[PDB]
Design a protein around this ligand. Sequence first.
Ligand SMILES: COc1cc(Br)c(OC)cc1N
Ligand SMILES: COc1cc(Br)c(OC)cc1N
Ligand SMILES: COc1cc(Br)c(OC)cc1N
Ligand SMILES: COc1cc(Br)c(OC)cc1N
Ligand SMILES: [N+]
Ligand SMILES: [N+]
Ligand SMILES: [N+]
Ligand SMILES: [N+]
Ligand SMILES: [N+]
Ligand SMILES: [N+]
Ligand SMILES: [N+]
Ligand SMILES: [N+]
Ligand SMILES: [N+]
Ligand SMILES: [N+]
Ligand SMILES: [N+]
Ligand SMILES: [N+]
Ligand SMILES: [N+]
Ligand SMILES: [N+]
Ligand SMILES: [N+]
Ligand SMILES: [N+]
Ligand SMILES: [N+]
Lengths: 300, 300
Amino acid sequence: GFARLKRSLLKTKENLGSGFISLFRGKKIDDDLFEELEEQLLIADVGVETTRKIITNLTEGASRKQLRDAEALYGLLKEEMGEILAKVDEPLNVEGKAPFVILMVGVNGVGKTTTIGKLARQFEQQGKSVMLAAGDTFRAAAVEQLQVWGQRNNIPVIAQHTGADSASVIFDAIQAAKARNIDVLIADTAGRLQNKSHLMEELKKIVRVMKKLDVEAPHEVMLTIDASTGQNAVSQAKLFHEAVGLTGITLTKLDGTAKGGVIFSVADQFGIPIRYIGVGERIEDLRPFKADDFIEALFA
Amino acid sequence: GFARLKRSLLKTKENLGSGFISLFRGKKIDDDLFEELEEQLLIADVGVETTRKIITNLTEGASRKQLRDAEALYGLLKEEMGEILAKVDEPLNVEGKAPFVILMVGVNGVGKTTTIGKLARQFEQQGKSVMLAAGDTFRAAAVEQLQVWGQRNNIPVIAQHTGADSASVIFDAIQAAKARNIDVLIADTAGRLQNKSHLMEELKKIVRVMKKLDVEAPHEVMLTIDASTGQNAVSQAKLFHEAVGLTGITLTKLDGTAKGGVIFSVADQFGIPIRYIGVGERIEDLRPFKADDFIEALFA
Ligand SMILES: COc1cc(Br)c(OC)cc1N
Ligand SMILES: COc1cc(Br)c(OC)cc1N
Ligand SMILES: COc1cc(Br)c(OC)cc1N
Ligand SMILES: COc1cc(Br)c(OC)cc1N
Ligand SMILES: [N+]
Ligand SMILES: [N+]
Ligand SMILES: [N+]
Ligand SMILES: [N+]
Ligand SMILES: [N+]
Ligand SMILES: [N+]
Ligand SMILES: [N+]
Ligand SMILES: [N+]
Ligand SMILES: [N+]
Ligand SMILES: [N+]
Ligand SMILES: [N+]
Ligand SMILES: [N+]
Ligand SMILES: [N+]
Ligand SMILES: [N+]
Ligand SMILES: [N+]
Ligand SMILES: [N+]
Ligand SMILES: [N+]
């Protein structure tokens, strides 16, 4: 089963899941084996600390039950790693708000705006009215692209002049969304990395200005990260988390990359729900994260 | 490809998958709507019990998620029905046997022999050696047809005189297949409906004689049914599963029919893996069943 998901994770299945099989066949459970396993986990971008946790738990349980063959570790791994993803398997519920406000954060070039469009189309297909806020105010090309997309897809896009104050754009966007009975407002933000502090202060200002119109907003702080950036995805995650406090994560480009294992780091180091995973070019390829499906396709 | 699949499933998409869209547009989630949906599912030959399961799960999920608009039901349906197919998405692996024995069961006039030829051609295209056994010994026309096909395609066909013992023909075919290093042996059988008892007992005899040469044979018991026969396809399945013990199902003629929903019944009532679906006249149109691809082409 899960043919399409397996196809997305093939390069990730090189090292994780079924990739363990060739590593365990006809081996004895000893320090050599745990070393090779640690190495294969690190290669998959699982991270030093997360790999340390997995190797430690596996070693202690194995030695306690004195498993004889290395093949028997496979199942244990499937459990351990599975548990990790299970702790971030909370889908996003955007119902019952006028509007439900999603603040989209992350650097540029990781599929953030693509995620905005896909989520917009999904929400509209679910019978909801969507509005966008072009809060990336200093990149005229990005804003105009978002506006042309809105015009082609009949979704309103709030924008201001190049160089406008993002918090003002998003403020006006919330006002217009409440006035027009919008169900979901998705607010884009600047994704420049240069000047970490400034971008952080800018996001905090956007939030504080949000609280003038609705203290519950933003209802979702969604970070977008790219799996094919390996451990960079981890750093970025921490960067934004310290500054605004994330509530959801979208992990894109899981297909066509061997760095998929980064998910286990992201899930383990932060425990923030992974709302969606991007496993293809289609709108439906931005899928709600289901930990069990992911594990089964990985370890098959 | 995917596009050709969607086009093949257009006539079934009238009522199922995307066919739900017009039914949910601008409607309120109430008993009237669930009644219209239940009716549309039954008309599509989804089956009474399976339709009840879908309607119940959909309703409970709706109330649990406090969905407002009927459009939002679409996704849940796509999941529900998808789950049904996901539980029978184990593809057929015919590797590593000398030969892998496929016992082809089913009635006549449902594409059984056509499926035999297509599977033979595919396996041969994959680099495997194929042999056929004309176990439908009492229909001289069928045997002669299978033989002329095998000679036209240079594939050996084991046969005996009209009225020979099918179990003997298949016995000789397994012996010769083991002797010639054949990878896959496909054995046809009688598909007469009159007097089930005779045919069923005949299949148990064929199996018992098979196990004299290879206790693992038959490695696959493949039922062939015709989707365009609606609930007849269900009955036949019930007939054969109780009688011989199936391990795979091929559903032919999914193109050009509005009764495609029968697949969801077959998957739900029996839980036997659906190995292939026939969506066209070409050799490649007998596709290995991928539940996710099928769902995506049906919906959206
Ligand atoms: C070209 O297609 C898009 C353009 C933009 Br801009 C986007 O962000 C809303 C999403 C998509 N899919
Ligand atoms: C100048 O960026 C802002 C825009 C609005 Br609107 C606001 O709320 C009055 C506060 C700030 N800082
Ligand atoms: C390739 O599937 C076939 C198998 C037989 Br046997 C046949 O009889 C001539 C026709 C077809 N298409
Ligand atoms: C008459 O059907 C059979 C054919 C063979 Br061959 C066999 O092996 C001795 C047993 C039986 N019953
Ligand atoms: N051990
Ligand atoms: N809001
Ligand atoms: N990011
Ligand atoms: N991007
Ligand atoms: N619009
Ligand atoms: N605007
Ligand atoms: N803007
Ligand atoms: N407003
Ligand atoms: N990233
Ligand atoms: N195609
Ligand atoms: N609608
Ligand atoms: N069959
Ligand atoms: N049969
Ligand atoms: N071929
Ligand atoms: N036959
Ligand atoms: N016979
Ligand atoms: N014989």
